[PDB]
């Protein structure tokens, strides 16, 4: 399951883009944030499936929760809550190289 590297790289770029949108804009570019969240969620659903196929359920639910965190970023009105989830998502994706 280890080779999921291009998917994690793309997911990291999307997460860092959202993080940049949240900080830069005071009222964020809501449609551009939705564009990156959709791509990110898609990438991590695949990462979760590859971990499931590789019998690595611990890293699979880890990937699943980061989808819920990205969905929270879409919902939440607090910029700091958006930052929190983005930094958490970023640090976990990095654990996967």
Residue numbers in the entry: 3 to 99
Give the text the authors published on this PDB structure.
However, unlike IL-4, they signal strictly through the type I complex, offering insights into the intertwined functions of the type I and type II complexes.
